Design a protein around this ligand. Structure first.
Ligand SMILES: *[C@@H]1O[C@H](CO)[C@@H](O[C@@H]2O[C@H](CO)[C@@H](O)[C@H](O)[C@H]2NC(C)=O)[C@H](O)[C@H]1NC(C)=O
Ligand SMILES: *[C@@H]1O[C@H](CO)[C@@H](O[C@@H]2O[C@H](CO)[C@@H](O)[C@H](O)[C@H]2NC(C)=O)[C@H](O)[C@H]1NC(C)=O
Ligand SMILES: *[C@@H]1O[C@H](CO)[C@@H](O[C@@H]2O[C@H](CO)[C@@H](O)[C@H](O)[C@H]2NC(C)=O)[C@H](O)[C@H]1NC(C)=O
Ligand SMILES: *[C@@H]1O[C@H](CO)[C@@H](O[C@@H]2O[C@H](CO)[C@@H](O)[C@H](O)[C@H]2NC(C)=O)[C@H](O)[C@H]1NC(C)=O
Ligand SMILES: *[C@@H]1O[C@H](CO)[C@@H](O[C@@H]2O[C@H](CO)[C@@H](O)[C@H](O)[C@H]2NC(C)=O)[C@H](O)[C@H]1NC(C)=O
Ligand SMILES: *[C@@H]1O[C@H](CO)[C@@H](O)[C@H](O)[C@H]1NC(C)=O
Lengths: 50, 50, 170, 98
């Protein structure tokens, strides 16, 4: 039954890790959108009059 | 194999004054590329068969 | 997951390649971050510097240009911004571009736009006295350039007061 | 007109081409070259009045003064038809007699 308990721990921690990764992916998408906006702003307002 | 410190680029000090300007006298025309994905392969996966 | 245990590792073996798949995404994220910073800041080909003597028609950029006194060579406003803001198998990797390099990019951009104008974003930087750059920038938004030359002192004082006010507010 | 949106330089036109799962643009841009050095001045006094250029900028090669378009060297004599007047030459910082 030690392997059964280990199995419980393993699946729980797997779920937690996968959730963490998915949240990271969503947040990365948000940050990338913001960075693209920043690059556009800095190429259109700093390097020339808008 | 060598390891070094990244070089941000060249180093020039533009000759600023208060009564001097620079005006171009010739031009060139450049053709450049830009590649953008617009689509990816449509794929279907059955539940029961898989 | 296993915390340095053998039997746990053997049990985890029969789950297939979950961990390769997981760790393949974090790498994409990190590469994405480095690309983000590079494409935001590395907009210039060269690195410009400002002349020692600074007579920009009365405008005063001392609060914005970097201060050689501090080791980081960051300007006063950047210093305020930096001051204000606040394992178990996890690792934090350092960013590729150190803060000093980022400051150097910002200084290059700002010196170029002070001296050249917009011309350094298209071809090679062309110097232009700062007053008759603001004249072009008024001419851009409709107001004739006569206004700037006839109200230079007031405009400069207003700009300096605004920059001091933003300094205090921050 | 927005800077660096398509092509690094001053935009002229673009051409599309297809690619297996995307598009490829060929941007045609104009880039200046072969700079030079000149002496400038924001306005010109004349009979007390202060002339400014309609479109262009004042330059000098050392002995004479000219008005040119900004993005391409092409000197022209300064006439009353390419300049306009506003006030007298007593408040501008940098007028030059001509
Ligand atoms: C502007 O640049 C062009 C391109 O370099 C110059 O044209 C060249 O002139 C040389 C000298 O006669 C030729 O050997 C090249 O073959 C020309 N290039 C092309 C693409 O034809 C042109 O002379 C320059 N303009 C001025 C006023 O100097
Ligand atoms: C630009 O503004 C700064 C203010 O930040 C001026 O620096 C002050 O200069 C006076 C005398 O020159 C000193 O008494 C102050 O202590 C300085 N302030 C600081 C915060 O150092 C600077 O002089 C201005 N530039 C010019 C050309 O006058
Ligand atoms: C500045 O440009 C002017 C305009 O061309 C030059 O004046 C002419 O110079 C040529 C050179 O042989 C003479 O043949 C002309 O007679 C001059 N014009 C007049 C109205 O006399 C002048 O030489 C140039 N100076 C410099 C230092 O470049
Ligand atoms: C451009 O900068 C020079 C830098 O010297 C200015 O020359 C000074 O002009 C004032 C008044 O005209 C004199 O009192 C100084 O003695 C001059 N400096 C020197 C070293 O002699 C010039 O006035 C500036 N011109 C413009 C249009 O900004
Ligand atoms: C432009 O010309 C005017 C008049 O021709 C000059 O104004 C005179 O300058 C002298 C010398 O400074 C003064 O003594 C006179 O009082 C000024 N006024 C008059 C009505 O003569 C002016 O100095 C010239 N500009 C330059 C830069 O020399
Ligand atoms: C203008 O003159 C300065 C000083 O002599 C020089 O450094 C600069 O390179 C010159 N401009 C050009 C375009 O060569």
């Amino acid at each position: 039954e030690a392997e059964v308990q280990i199995d419980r721990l393993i699946t729980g921690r797997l779920q937690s890790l996968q959730t963490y990764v998915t949240q990271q992916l969503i947040r990365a998408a948000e940050i990338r959108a913001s960075a693209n906006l920043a690059a556009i702003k800095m190429s259109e307002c700093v390097l020339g009059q808008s | 194999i060598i390891a070094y410190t990244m070089s941000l680029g060249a180093e020039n000090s533009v000759a600023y004054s208060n009564n001097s300007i620079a005006i171009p006298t010739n031009f060139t025309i450049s053709v450049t590329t830009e590649i953008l994905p617009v689509s990816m392969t449509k794929t279907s996966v059955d539940c029961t068969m898989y | 997951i296993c915390g340095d245990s053998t039997e746990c590792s053997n049990l985890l073996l029969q789950y297939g390649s979950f961990c390769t798949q997981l760790n393949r995404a974090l790498t994409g994220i990190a590469v994405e971050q480095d690309k983000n910073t590079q494409e935001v800041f590395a907009q210039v080909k060269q690195i410009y510097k400002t002349p020692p003597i600074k007579d920009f028609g009365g405008f005063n950029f001392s609060q914005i240009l970097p201060d050689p006194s501090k080791p980081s060579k960051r300007s006063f406003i950047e210093d305020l911004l930096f001051n204000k803001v606040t394992f178990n198998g996890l690792t934090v990797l350092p960013p590729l571009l150190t803060d000093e390099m980022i400051a150097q990019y910002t200084s290059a951009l700002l010196a170029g736009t002070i001296t050249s104008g917009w011309t350094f974003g298209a071809g090679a930087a062309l110097q232009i006295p700062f007053a008759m750059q603001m004249a072009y920038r008024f001419n851009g938004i409709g107001v004739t350039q006569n206004v700037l030359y006839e109200n230079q002192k007031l405009i400069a004082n207003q700009f300096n007061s605004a920059i001091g006010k933003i300094q205090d507010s921050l | 007109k927005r800077v660096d949106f398509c092509g690094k330089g001053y935009h002229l036109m673009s051409f599309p081409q297809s690619a297996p799962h995307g598009v490829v643009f060929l941007h045609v841009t104009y880039v200046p070259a072969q700079e030079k050095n000149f002496t400038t001045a924001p306005a010109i006094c004349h009979d007390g009045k202060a002339h400014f250029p309609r479109e262009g900028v004042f330059v000098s090669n050392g002995t004479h003064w000219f008005v040119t378009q900004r993005n391409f060297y092409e000197p022209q004599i300064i006439t009353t038809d390419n300049t306009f007047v506003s006030g007298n030459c007593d408040v501008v910082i940098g007028i030059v007699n001509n």
